[PDB]
Amino acid sequence: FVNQHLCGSHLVEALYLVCGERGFFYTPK
Amino acid sequence: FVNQHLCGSHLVEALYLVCGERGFFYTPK
Amino acid sequence: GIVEQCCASVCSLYQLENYCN
Amino acid sequence: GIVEQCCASVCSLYQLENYCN
């Protein structure tokens, strides 16, 4: 699922799945 | 959509919708 | 943290916006 | 940023993990 174009909710979803209980930051601009 | 229990992808989704182009940080632990 | 306030209990816009950049 | 590297172009695990806490 990660090695593709990922935009908006699709990108946030990938971060959530990959990062797990570490969480993440989403900084689009 | 925000004034309910929100867990896991549901919570990340709410942050994405509310925060818009500011983005957000998700720090569950 | 956010899990305690929005998953384990009822979330709010006031709390969610605290996590926006 | 992340949009340029993963939306406007093809994402990678190596880049996504850079955004994990």
Author numbering:
A (entry chain B), B (entry chain B): 1 to 29
C (entry chain A), D (entry chain A): 1 to 21
Reproduce passages from the article.
The complications of data collection using these twinned protein crystals were similar to the small-molecule examples. Automatic cell determination failed, but both RLATT and CELL_NOW clearly identified two domains in the case of insulin and three domains for glucose isomerase, and their orientation matrices were used in SAINT in the same way as for the small molecules. TWINABS produced detwinned HKLF 4 data and several HKLF 5 data sets. PDB2INS was used to convert the .pdb file to a SHELX.ins file.
The structure contains 51 amino acids in two chains connected by three disulfide bonds. Bovine insulin (Sigma; catalogue No. Crystals were grown by the hanging-drop vapour-diffusion method at 20°C by equilibration against a reservoir consisting of 0.2 M Na2HPO4/Na3PO4 pH 10.0, 0.01 M Na EDTA. Cubic crystals grew in about 1 h, and most of the crystals were interpenetrant owing to the high concentration of protein (which was deliberate in order to encourage the growth of twinned crystals) [Fig. 11(a), right]. Cubic insulin crystallizes in space group I213, which belongs to the lower symmetry cubic Laue group. In our case, CELL_NOW indexed the two domains using alternative settings. Using these data, SHELXD found the positions of three disulfide bridges. Density modification and autotracing modules in a beta version of SHELXE could trace two chains.
